[PDB]
A paper describes a structure:
SARS-CoV-2 RdRp, also referred to as nonstructural protein 12 (Nsp12), is the catalytic center of the macromolecular complex frequently referred to as the replication transcription complex (RTC). The RTC is essential for virus replication because it makes copies of genomic and subgenomic RNAs and polymerizes antisense RNA. In SARS-CoV-2, besides RdRp (Nsp12), the RTC involves nonstructural proteins Nsp7, Nsp8, and others. Nsp12 is the largest component of the complex, and Nsp7 and Nsp8 are considered cofactors.
Numbering used by the authors:
A (entry chain A): -1 to 70
B (entry chain B): 78 to 192
C (entry chain C): -1 to 73
D (entry chain D): 78 to 194
The structure:
């Protein structure tokens, strides 16, 4: 469980960086929400909270039509 | 360019990390997005919060919707409306195996988070 | 060891973010060096190269005196 | 407030990930840093490139230095200068077990990389 916690925290930092490179920062209020979710994951008490906040944060990336290609 | 190569590597690594996490809710939203079932807003975490999702085809509809319940992100959602690509309402009875060819896909489902 | 590659790349993104929060100046040569190291790790194809570049990138954090408490962070 | 807590959480996770990677060169620099043996500049990667490191005590010096060779970060380094805490140059001949108590620790070693990575 603990190593899952470190991995999900690392992944949240990557996810925020991916959104940053996709220029989400220029959209100031969406960016503020993304930062807050990232912070919530880094401060998460347990893996349940971390993964719920990661669902919200990842959904930002999944909602960006054509910005990335999930199939690859 | 160089920026694009780094970005591609970072995004690839992101999805490899997500796959290794192997969490049910993250897997669900990623697999749905791979099929074109994607959220239109940030997925919320509190009761009765609003969620809008693209449903691209009948197979995705049947795998995610039972009566007025939408199942997504390891949670249940109460369907409020289903609208077609022309923003016109679609009654649930119209969304059948035999009738789906006649609908203007994709559909957009609007739902509220349950318990 | 191909199985560890995703973890080293994830860690390099974290390390660059930690350095950014510590106010390593954007206009600085050091910051440009940090970014190049991070990019090279992300583009690495074998763990030997990734780890050598991670040694250099991590040394930037280890060199910032009293900016971090390494013993505390490793408790 | 929260900004400092987020920073602490990110830095702690960083070191947990590093520990999980379990690479010898990373472990060497981290464990040396925990002992106070820290680089003063970014570690370079090419043959004959320069590096400065704090050597906090004789126990570390004995663990890392033999003659004009410094072993650090899974690499060999040729020592160019040792200075003591009084900013005075220490000739390598004086850093002996018998003379170690007369030196002003910590020392700073300047070295050039011996081989390419």
């Amino acid at each position: 469980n603990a190593s899952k916690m470190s991995d999900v925290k690392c992944t949240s930092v990557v996810l925020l960086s991916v959104l940053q490179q996709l220029r989400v920062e220029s959209s100031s209020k969406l960016w503020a929400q993304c930062v807050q979710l990232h912070n919530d994951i880094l401060l998460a008490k347990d893996t349940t909270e971390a993964f719920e906040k990661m669902v919200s944060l990842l959904s930002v990336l999944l909602s960006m039509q054509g910005a990335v290609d999930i199939n690859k | 360019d160089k920026r694009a190569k780094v970005t591609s590597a970072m995004q690839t690594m992101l999805f490899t990390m997500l796959r290794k996490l192997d969490n049910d809710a993250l897997n669900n939203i990623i697999n749905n997005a791979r099929d074109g079932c994607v959220p239109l807003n940030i997925i919320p975490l509190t009761t009765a919060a609003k969620l809008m999702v693209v449903i691209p085809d009948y197979n995705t509809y049947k795998n995610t919707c039972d009566g007025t319940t939408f199942t997504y992100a390891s949670a249940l959602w109460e369907i409020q409306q289903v609208v077609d690509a022309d923003s016109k309402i679609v009654q649930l009875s119209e969304i059948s195996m035999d009738n789906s060819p006649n609908l203007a896909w994709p559909l957009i489902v609007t739902a509220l988070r349950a318990n």
